[PDB]
């Protein structure tokens, strides 16, 4: 499967001036566009080489739409402050994510659109793209209103139509990277914590996409105790990194095997000290 996903954050700045607004587009785990109210252009900007191939008409359009998104968030911060009956003194946040997934076939699989105020679910579009999930009674008002305005219809048209038509366009144009898996470069490290015990660490580096599984085995059986697993982390060059460690008795390092599953590996790897 593949996905195109837009992320939007607005943060009210009560002391002076309008809210901070940041938008990022992604194809799978590749950021490809950006907008930031504080930056100089006041334009949607490219962040992947494969999107620079689009002409000015595309950039004017995306810039128009992203500004319109910005205003809608500014406006919504007002609505929400009243609804939740908060003062004009506090800073508040609105977050929005929407996007479509295509499946193995490159045909529409899934659409989504979720909205949060101060880091809490407010409203979200349901699976069927026809109805809404209101988290509380403020959102209920929105749900009833948006249902009466057929907001869903316009959104469904986009998510199952345009969204997937452009995701395919991006995938073809950026096939050299977006359709290439970088398999993990893997290795192990030994960290003598005392005379009696040691820490084995299993490393996955320079892989893409972000999805990866690292698991430990003792004598061919899954072990979880005395392990640690860090959150997957960006390398900074478009790839990701992750590791998993296990504390082991000294001299017993060979019982333990690290197992690595990833899309760009034909068969799962195994490593051993």
């Amino acid at each position: 499967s593949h996905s195109m996903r837009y992320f939007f954050t607005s943060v009210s700045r009560p002391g002076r001036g309008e809210p901070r607004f940041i938008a990022v587009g992604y194809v799978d785990d590749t950021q490809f566009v950006r907008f930031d109210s504080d930056a100089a252009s006041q334009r949607m900007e490219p962040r992947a080489p494969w999107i620079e191939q689009e002409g000015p008409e595309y950039w004017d359009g995306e810039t128009r739409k992203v500004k319109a998104h910005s205003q809608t968030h500014r406006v919504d911060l007002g609505t929400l402050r009243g609804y939740y009956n908060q003062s004009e003194a506090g800073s508040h946040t609105v977050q929005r994510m929407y996007g479509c997934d295509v499946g193995s076939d490159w045909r529409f699989l899934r659409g989504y659109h979720q909205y949060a105020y101060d880091g809490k679910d407010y409203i979200a579009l349901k699976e069927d793209l026809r109805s809404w999930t209101a988290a509380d009674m403020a959102a209920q008002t929105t749900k009833h209103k948006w249902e009466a305005a057929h907001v869903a219809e316009q959104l469904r048209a986009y998510l199952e139509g345009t969204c997937v038509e452009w995701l395919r366009r991006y995938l073809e144009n950026g096939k050299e990277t977006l359709q290439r898996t970088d398999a993990p470069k893997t290795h192990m490290t030994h960290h003598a914590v005392s005379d009696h015990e040691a820490t084995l660490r299993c490393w996955a580096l320079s892989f893409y996409p972000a999805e990866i599984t690292l698991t430990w085995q003792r004598d061919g059986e899954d072990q979880t105790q005395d392990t640690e697993l860090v959150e997957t982390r960006p390398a900074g060059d478009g790839t990701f990194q992750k590791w998993a460690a296990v504390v082991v008795p000294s001299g017993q390092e060979q019982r333990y095997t690290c197992h690595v599953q990833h899309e760009g590996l034909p068969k799962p790897l195994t490593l051993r000290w």
Binding site: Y6, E62, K65, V66, H69, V75, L80
Partner: peptide, 11 residues
Amino acid sequence: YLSPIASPLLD
């Protein structure tokens, strides 16, 4: 390619 419309909570 962004959604061409972004309807507010209140119009």
